[PDB]
C-alpha cells in the first residue's frame, strides 16, 4: 500500500530517533581492569578495598566507586525498563522498515530496463 | 492504506472516531423517535 519514498522517510526518522535515545541511555561498562604492583608481597596482600579505598559495596560499582572517606521506587524503576524497551522498539521498527524498503528496491530494480538473463554483462550506452 | 502514526496523531484520530459514533447514535435515536410519532 505504500511507495518507496514513504518507507525511506520513516526509516530515517527512526534512525535519528534511535541515535538520540541511544545517546541518552546509559550502559554499564564491561571492560577488564588490571593493576600493576611493584612487588609480589604487595601483590599477595592486595585487596580491592584497600586499593580503591572503598567499601565492599562500592567495589562492585565500577562507575561510581566513591571513596569511603567521602562517604563519611517500583514505579520509578519500571519507567526505566519501559524506557530501555522504547529504544529497543525503535531498533525493531528500523530493521522492519529496512526489510520492507529492501524488497521495494528489488522490485523496482527488476522492473529496470536490462538484459536480465541475473543480469547479463552488457555495457549500458 | 497502511501508515505509521505517532502518539499525538493517534490520539487525534481516536478522538474523532469517538465523536462520530456518538453523533451517529444521537442522530439515529432522534430519527427513531420522530419516526414513531
Amino acid at each position: 500500500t505504500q511507495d518507496s519514498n514513504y518507507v525511506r522517510t520513516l526509516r530515517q526518522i527512526e534512525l535519528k530517533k534511535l541515535e538520540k535515545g541511544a545517546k541518552q541511555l546509559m550502559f554499564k561498562s564491561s571492560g577488564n581492569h588490571t593493576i600493576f604492583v611493584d612487588s609480589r608481597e604487595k601483590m599477595n596482600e592486595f585487596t580491592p578495598e584497600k586499593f580503591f579505598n572503598t567499601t565492599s559495596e562500592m567495589v562492585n560499582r565500577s562507575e561510581n566507586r566513591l571513596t569511603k572517606d567521602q562517604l563519611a521506587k517500583e514505579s520509578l524503576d519500571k519507567k526505566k525498563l519501559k524506557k530501555f524497551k522504547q529504544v529497543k522498539q525503535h531498533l525493531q521498527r528500523e530493521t522492519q522498515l529496512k526489510q520492507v524498503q529492501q524488497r521495494m528496491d528489488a522490485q523496482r530494480e527488476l522492473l529496470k530496463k536490462g538484459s536480465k538473463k541475473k543480469w547479463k554483462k552488457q555495457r549500458k550506452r | 492504506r497502511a501508515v505509521v502514526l505517532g502518539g499525538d496523531e493517534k490520539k487525534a484520530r481516536s478522538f474523532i472516531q469517538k465523536v462520530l459514533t456518538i453523533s451517529k447514535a444521537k442522530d439515529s435515536k432522534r430519527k427513531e423517535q420522530k419516526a414513531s410519532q
Binding site: 522498539q89 521498527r93 522492519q96 | 501508515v3 505509521v4 493517534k10 484520530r13 474523532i16 472516531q17
Partner: peptide, 11 residues
Amino acid sequence: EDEDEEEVLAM
C-alpha cells in the same frame, strides 16, 4: 480519510 488509512507497526 481516516477510515481509508490503516495504522501499522504500533507501539
